[PDB]
Design an enzyme around this catalytic site. Structure first.
Site, short mmCIF file in Angstrom:
data_model
loop_
_atom_site.label_atom_id
_atom_site.label_comp_id
_atom_site.label_asym_id
_atom_site.label_seq_id
_atom_site.Cartn_x
_atom_site.Cartn_y
_atom_site.Cartn_z
N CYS B 116 0.16 -2.85 6.44
CA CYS B 116 -0.15 -1.59 5.76
C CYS B 116 1.12 -0.95 5.24
O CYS B 116 1.98 -0.54 6.03
CB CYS B 116 -0.87 -0.63 6.71
SG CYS B 116 -1.17 1.02 5.99
N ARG B 119 2.00 3.27 6.21
CA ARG B 119 2.20 3.75 7.58
C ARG B 119 3.24 4.86 7.74
O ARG B 119 3.51 5.25 8.88
CB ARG B 119 2.59 2.60 8.49
CG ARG B 119 1.50 1.63 8.83
CD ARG B 119 2.11 0.52 9.69
NE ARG B 119 2.86 -0.47 8.91
CZ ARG B 119 3.65 -1.39 9.46
NH1 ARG B 119 3.81 -1.42 10.78
NH2 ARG B 119 4.28 -2.29 8.70
N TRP B 288 -6.03 6.86 1.46
CA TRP B 288 -6.14 6.99 0.02
C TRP B 288 -5.57 5.74 -0.64
O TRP B 288 -4.83 4.97 -0.03
CB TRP B 288 -5.45 8.26 -0.51
CG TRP B 288 -4.04 8.42 -0.05
CD1 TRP B 288 -2.95 7.79 -0.53
CD2 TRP B 288 -3.58 9.27 1.01
NE1 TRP B 288 -1.82 8.19 0.15
CE2 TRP B 288 -2.18 9.10 1.10
CE3 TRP B 288 -4.22 10.16 1.89
CZ2 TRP B 288 -1.40 9.78 2.04
CZ3 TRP B 288 -3.44 10.85 2.81
CH2 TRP B 288 -2.04 10.66 2.88
N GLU B 293 -4.69 -1.32 -5.87
CA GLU B 293 -5.87 -1.80 -5.15
C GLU B 293 -7.13 -1.68 -5.99
O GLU B 293 -8.00 -2.55 -5.93
CB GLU B 293 -6.06 -1.04 -3.84
CG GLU B 293 -4.90 -1.04 -2.87
CD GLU B 293 -5.25 -0.27 -1.59
OE1 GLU B 293 -5.89 -0.88 -0.70
OE2 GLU B 293 -4.93 0.94 -1.50
C1 HEM Z 1 -2.95 6.92 3.66
C2 HEM Z 1 -2.85 6.05 2.65
C3 HEM Z 1 -2.86 4.52 2.89
C4 HEM Z 1 -2.43 3.64 1.99
C5 HEM Z 1 -1.86 3.97 0.59
C6 HEM Z 1 -2.60 2.31 2.54
C7 HEM Z 1 -2.27 1.13 1.91
C8 HEM Z 1 -2.66 -0.13 2.31
C9 HEM Z 1 -2.73 -1.30 1.47
C10 HEM Z 1 -2.36 -1.29 -0.04
C11 HEM Z 1 -3.14 -2.33 2.22
C12 HEM Z 1 -3.36 -3.77 1.69
C13 HEM Z 1 -4.78 -3.80 1.13
C14 HEM Z 1 -5.01 -4.94 0.19
O1 HEM Z 1 -4.28 -5.05 -0.82
O2 HEM Z 1 -5.97 -5.71 0.42
C15 HEM Z 1 -3.35 -1.85 3.57
C16 HEM Z 1 -3.77 -2.55 4.69
C17 HEM Z 1 -4.13 -2.01 5.92
N1 HEM Z 1 -4.21 -0.66 6.24
FE1 HEM Z 1 -3.42 0.82 5.15
N2 HEM Z 1 -3.14 2.43 3.81
C18 HEM Z 1 -3.32 3.78 4.07
C19 HEM Z 1 -3.87 4.29 5.24
C20 HEM Z 1 -4.32 3.60 6.36
C21 HEM Z 1 -4.96 4.15 7.53
C22 HEM Z 1 -5.30 5.65 7.73
C23 HEM Z 1 -5.23 3.13 8.36
C24 HEM Z 1 -5.89 3.19 9.76
C25 HEM Z 1 -5.87 4.31 10.51
C26 HEM Z 1 -4.75 1.91 7.76
C27 HEM Z 1 -4.81 0.63 8.28
C28 HEM Z 1 -4.60 -0.54 7.57
C29 HEM Z 1 -4.77 -1.89 8.08
C30 HEM Z 1 -5.19 -2.20 9.53
C31 HEM Z 1 -4.47 -2.76 7.10
C32 HEM Z 1 -4.49 -4.31 7.18
C33 HEM Z 1 -5.90 -4.84 7.46
C34 HEM Z 1 -5.94 -6.35 7.32
O3 HEM Z 1 -5.39 -7.07 8.21
O4 HEM Z 1 -6.52 -6.84 6.31
N3 HEM Z 1 -4.22 2.23 6.55
N4 HEM Z 1 -3.05 -0.51 3.58
C1 LIG Z 2 -7.00 2.31 5.27
C2 LIG Z 2 -6.78 1.68 3.93
C3 LIG Z 2 -6.35 2.45 2.87
C4 LIG Z 2 -6.17 1.86 1.63
N1 LIG Z 2 -5.74 2.59 0.56
N2 LIG Z 2 -6.42 0.54 1.48
C5 LIG Z 2 -6.84 -0.23 2.50
C6 LIG Z 2 -7.09 -1.58 2.31
C7 LIG Z 2 -7.51 -2.40 3.36
C8 LIG Z 2 -7.80 -3.84 3.10
C9 LIG Z 2 -8.92 -4.10 2.30
C10 LIG Z 2 -9.30 -5.40 1.98
C11 LIG Z 2 -8.56 -6.47 2.48
C12 LIG Z 2 -8.93 -7.91 2.17
C13 LIG Z 2 -9.08 -8.13 0.66
N3 LIG Z 2 -7.88 -7.67 -0.08
C14 LIG Z 2 -7.46 -6.21 3.29
C15 LIG Z 2 -7.08 -4.91 3.61
O1 LIG Z 2 -5.98 -4.71 4.39
C16 LIG Z 2 -7.69 -1.83 4.62
F1 LIG Z 2 -8.11 -2.58 5.66
C17 LIG Z 2 -7.45 -0.47 4.81
C18 LIG Z 2 -7.02 0.33 3.75
#
Ligand code: HEM
Ligand SMILES: Cc1cc(N)nc2cc(-c3ccc(CCN)cc3O)c(F)cc12
Ligand code: HEM
Ligand SMILES: Cc1cc(N)nc2cc(-c3ccc(CCN)cc3O)c(F)cc12
Ligand SMILES: C[C@H](O)[C@H](O)[C@H]1CNc2nc(N)[nH]c(=O)c2N1
Ligand SMILES: C[C@H](O)[C@H](O)[C@H]1CNc2nc(N)[nH]c(=O)c2N1
Ligand SMILES: [Zn+2]
Lengths: 414, 418
Positions: B116, B119, B288, B293
């Site tokens: 993420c 964070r 957000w 994305e």
């Molecule tokens: C606040 C704005 C946030 C932004 C901009 C953000 C951004 C991102 C992005 C861009 C990804 C990759 C997603 C993809 O391209 O498929 C990601 C993954 C992830 N986010 Fe965040 N995030 C945010 C908040 C959070 C919150 C609040 C949580 C949980 C409390 C969280 C937990 C996670 C987790 C666990 C992953 C990885 C999941 C996996 O293994 O696929 N995020 N985040």
């Molecule tokens: C909290 C949160 C915020 C955000 N703005 N985006 C998020 C994207 C993913 C996420 C979505 C899809 C996939 C697999 C396909 N890409 C992996 C991710 O980590 C996620 F879990 C959480 C997100």
């Protein structure tokens, strides 16, 4: 035991048996992953060289369907006699060609590996002096350039012996532009090459102090101090960079050389170390266009292109950097294509790599790949390698990093 | 100790936090699996209700870590808590988290999420306890309130809603949706696809459950909610809770005429949150969007919207060969437009330059105060223009810390119906 890799875009699944055959470390542990560490972690004794040689000779005779033959056993015995009496051994020409090709085939960071079997090998293990190395490199350059129809080639200088008598190309690539820092903190030429440019100047090079100065070759033979040589200008093919739509683009005065030719890596075959082994192919557009003008540590015509595009450069969210980066890469590709100089775009390159990966899984049981490096430096997720799971492991023969030669060279003059 | 280095700035950071890592990464000294989607099946506990010597050592570790975090290790309340957890396990084969413990563990599961880039916000998380919930209707009420709070008329707020933990494995709470708000994807008779092609399978499961699809192009899917292991149930999120942004372009007037929109709230609902041996199989969390994305993956994957084509067409790009970079050029405009539309409607969004620069600052913070920060370079680098962002040149160490968010199989592969 088997490992699977999936392509989440096509759903194709491949089965990797080849990974069982690696015995060199990757840097990761069971509990930490170091996949994005750039470099993770004197000479071989008798007892260490025996099994490494045994492993190579074995795989060579396996590849030509002669494993266990009378010739296989004689070569093995002949290799051990050399290691036992001279503490080293000499590769046959067939073995040298084979290992150079497989070092490329094994390069997990190289997207360009569908071409590995068409690699022209120049045996230079008879070279003794830096003037000799210069001759060999000039011939390499002429052959590889082929008036724009670029051809892959490697030139292999004598192997390491005791580490006191090494051959090195001190250049990182055979063709590079100089960089000069100015008293006022500005930079002229290529900021990437400032350090090596000072080294040349200190060695006596008379720098033109222009924008696109081809650097001299700094050539080390048999452990002696390195020597300067000017590549003849008519051997350096260059492409002036223009844009198909933006007529002002040519007025930036930019150009690049056509031959990518890396010269600072070390070739390892059967335990032998070939510390000078320049090799060359042809460019993917983004290596000039994303990293050779637009890296924050490079020419920084990004802002000038954005200025000339009247882009809103106040806020990031306008994506002027992204936008100007695309146009520069369009300019690079159009330019090489117009001057009929071989170049490949990242889409065409990655597509070919996928086909290569599939074919290598079929006939070889796997294909070590470094996603972090295989994915292009721009537009990553719209290329097919982005959704392709990959396994990374170190096979030998391989190309290895080695330290810059000025850090370890003990000098001899005055 | 392990060093990471940023090759633009030469800043070198020194990592000791990885010494506290528990789960395997899948890598060995002889193989790297960093581009495998799910490289490891190493879990902290077996498939279902553990024995005491399985559950309790994980609970002690977590309780230990929480009381250490508040400078109270070995205190009166820490020794009392250990005994309380022991008796609960001894008498129910599980235990219940205190609310402070629940809040800490949710925030730290985000802080530990190596993929993420968001964070830097990790400790500003609103935690809604929903562990008293017993039916899908209640889950629907909790989810609506979550959506309303997090959306906040466009001033988005981070939040997670936590439903009852798994007990024996047969009584799971699940949200069958992968995200709370997604668009239907309709398989077409002539072979093609209408809507959004990731969600086809799920769209069919909804119709199969009785959902009457409007068969438009932006059809907010219904919620499919499972409580206490029962068959899941359908609910339509009230539209006035689904904020949507129509996509236009600051420069191309013809862009809005593509009739394009997207929702403001990303809310992931199919992941598993694990704290001290407990597993919350229903824990939807939202933040957000980073602009990429929506407009690199949700419009421009080959197995997604694939309307790069139209945007390139209206731009009058040469689509004959790939060296013209028509995909690259249209992909940029789409992302310029997404940011413009969201900012114009005062709906929170972050561009990939700002988000990556925030993440570099966050890494420094974490190494200064925590001794490290686990990061997955493959997921941190944005899907476009990677090398002109500051995370591209930043080495990263990836390790697995607990509390954490985990994957889990889609419930229709394991659910026995009634
Ligand atoms: C606040 C704005 C946030 C932004 C901009 C953000 C951004 C991102 C992005 C861009 C990804 C990759 C997603 C993809 O391209 O498929 C990601 C993954 C992830 N986010 Fe965040 N995030 C945010 C908040 C959070 C919150 C609040 C949580 C949980 C409390 C969280 C937990 C996670 C987790 C666990 C992953 C990885 C999941 C996996 O293994 O696929 N995020 N985040
Ligand atoms: C909290 C949160 C915020 C955000 N703005 N985006 C998020 C994207 C993913 C996420 C979505 C899809 C996939 C697999 C396909 N890409 C992996 C991710 O980590 C996620 F879990 C959480 C997100
Ligand atoms: C023929 C066309 C070729 C293309 C298009 C190509 C492409 C590339 C690219 C784009 C990279 C990444 C470089 C960077 O991002 O900075 C790379 C790395 C590499 N290439 Fe190739 N290559 C070609 C030929 C070759 C040949 C002929 C060899 C050797 C015989 C070779 C060996 C390598 C190695 C060893 C690396 C990685 C070195 C490292 O950093 O560890 N390539 N290649
Ligand atoms: C044979 C070849 C062809 C090509 N077209 N390109 C190549 C790029 C590199 C290369 C250059 C620099 C770096 C480190 C700085 N990014 C890593 C590399 O792999 C290389 F060795 C060989 C290349
Ligand atoms: C720190 C980072 O891992 C490093 O700069 C790498 C990332 N991946 C790369 N990938 C390619 N193809 N070329 C590069 O120079 C780099 N740089
Ligand atoms: C196979 C590949 O590793 C996989 O599709 C990943 C790559 N990196 C990613 N990174 C982000 N941020 N989001 C993704 O969906 C993916 N997909
Ligand atoms: Zn790894």
């Amino acid at each position: 035991r088997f490992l699977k890799v999936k392509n989440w875009e096509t759903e194709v699944v491949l089965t990797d048996t080849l990974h069982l055959k690696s015995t060199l470390e990757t840097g990761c542990t069971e509990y930490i992953c170091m996949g994005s560490i750039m470099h993770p972690s004197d000479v071989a004794t008798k007892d260490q060289l025996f099994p490494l040689a045994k492993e190579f000779i074995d795989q060579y005779y396996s590849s030509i369907k002669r494993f266990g033959s009378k010739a296989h056993m004689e070569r093995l015995e002949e290799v051990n006699k050399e290691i036992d009496t001279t503490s080293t051994y000499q590769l046959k020409d067939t073995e040298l060609i084979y290992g150079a090709k497989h070092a490329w085939r094994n390069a997990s960071r190289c997207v360009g590996r569908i071409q590995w079997s068409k690699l022209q090998v120049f045996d230079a293990r008879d070279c003794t002096t830096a003037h000799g190395m210069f001759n060999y490199i000039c011939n390499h350059v002429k052959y590889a350039t082929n008036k724009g129809n670029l051809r892959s080639a490697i030139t292999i200088f004598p192997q390491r012996t005791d580490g006191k008598h090494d051959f090195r190309v001190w250049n990182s690539q055979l063709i590079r532009y100089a960089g000069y820092k100015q008293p006022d903190g500005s930079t002229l030429g290529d900021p990437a090459n400032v350090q090596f440019t000072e080294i040349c100047i200190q060695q006596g090079w008379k720098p033109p102090r222009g924008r696109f100065d081809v650097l001299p070759l700094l050539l080390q033979a048999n452990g002696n101090d390195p020597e300067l040589f000017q590549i003849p200008p008519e051997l350096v093919l260059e492409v002036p960079i223009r844009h198909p739509k933006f007529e002002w683009f040519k007025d930036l005065g930019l150009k690049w050389y056509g031959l990518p030719a890396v010269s600072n890596m070390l070739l390892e075959i059967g335990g032998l170390e070939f510390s000078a082994c320049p090799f060359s192919g042809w460019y993917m557009g983004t290596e000039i266009g994303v990293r050779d003008y637009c890296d924050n540590s490079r020419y920084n015509i990004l802002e000038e292109v954005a200025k000339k595009m009247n882009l809103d450069m106040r806020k990031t969210s306008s994506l002027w950097k992204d936008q100007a980066l695309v146009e520069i890469n369009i300019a690079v590709l159009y330019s090489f294509q117009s001057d009929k100089v071989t170049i490949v775009d990242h889409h065409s390159a990655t597509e070919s790599f996928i086909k290569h990966m599939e074919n290598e899984y079929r006939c070889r049981g796997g294909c070590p790949a470094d996603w972090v490096w295989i994915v292009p430096p721009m537009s990553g997720s719209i290329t097919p390698v982005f959704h392709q799971e990959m396994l990374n492991y170190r096979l030998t023969p391989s190309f290895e990093y080695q330290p810059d030669p000025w850090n370890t060279h003990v000098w001899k003059l005055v």
